[PDB]
Amino acid sequence: EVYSEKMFTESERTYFMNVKENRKGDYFLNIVESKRSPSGDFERHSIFVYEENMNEFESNLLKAIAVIKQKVST
Amino acid sequence: ERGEVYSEKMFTESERTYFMNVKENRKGDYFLNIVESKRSPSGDFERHSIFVYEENMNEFESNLLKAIAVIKQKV
Ligand SMILES: [Mg+2]
Ligand SMILES: [Mg+2]
């Protein structure tokens, strides 16, 4: 791991933002959603993005988020 | 599609394809859904899906951009 940030929320949902380096030396982004169940177990949902797709992934996320931000401020 | 505000599909040169969706719940709140569909060596498609709700959108965006900035500066 090169970078790792844990984003708690006020609910039982926590997000992890991880940057890791592979063997070829390439970087990848890993976004994780971890949700606590009433039993104290965790469900985790994990997405990976290769550095070669980073600009396009970022542009696409920003566009989708922008829709929500506009609605919220609307 | 009723309940879907926004939907985009992103092919890559890898076995990973992405979907960025904005959905609307019963109350009219918007929420984000990010999906990675990964083709396995065998031909089965695994699907990974994350949801982010309105109350966490700004912080999620900020944290996502901060991690991406790490990659930007390290290339
Ligand atoms: Mg919490
Ligand atoms: Mg492909």
Numbering used by the authors:
A (entry chain B): 11 to 84
B (entry chain A): 8 to 82
Structure paper excerpt:
Crystals of selenomethione-substituted B. burgdorferi Pur-α 8–105 (L17M, F27M, I64M) belonged to space group I212121 and diffracted up to 1.9 Å resolution. The PUR repeat of B. burgdorferi Pur-α crystallized as a strongly intertwined dimer. Each PUR repeat is comprised of a four-stranded anti-parallel β-sheet followed by an α-helix. The interaction of two monomers results in a globular domain that we refer to as PUR domain. The part of the crystallized protein that is visible in the experimental electron density (amino acids 8 to 84) matches the homology region that was identified as PUR repeat (amino acids 8 to 81). In the B. burgdorferi case, the interaction relies on a dimer built by two identical monomers, whereas in D. melanogaster Pur-α, an intra-molecular dimer is formed by its PUR repeats I and II.
Pur-α is a ubiquitous, highly conserved protein involved in a variety of cellular processes such as transcription, cell cycle control, mRNA transport, and neuronal development. When searching databases for proteins with PUR repeats in lower species, we found that a bacterial hypothetical protein (Borrelia burgdorferi B31 gene bank entry BB0047) contains a single PUR repeat. We found that the B. burgdorferi Pur-α and the nucleic acid-binding region of human Pur-α bound with comparable affinities to DNA oligomers with (GGN)n sequences.
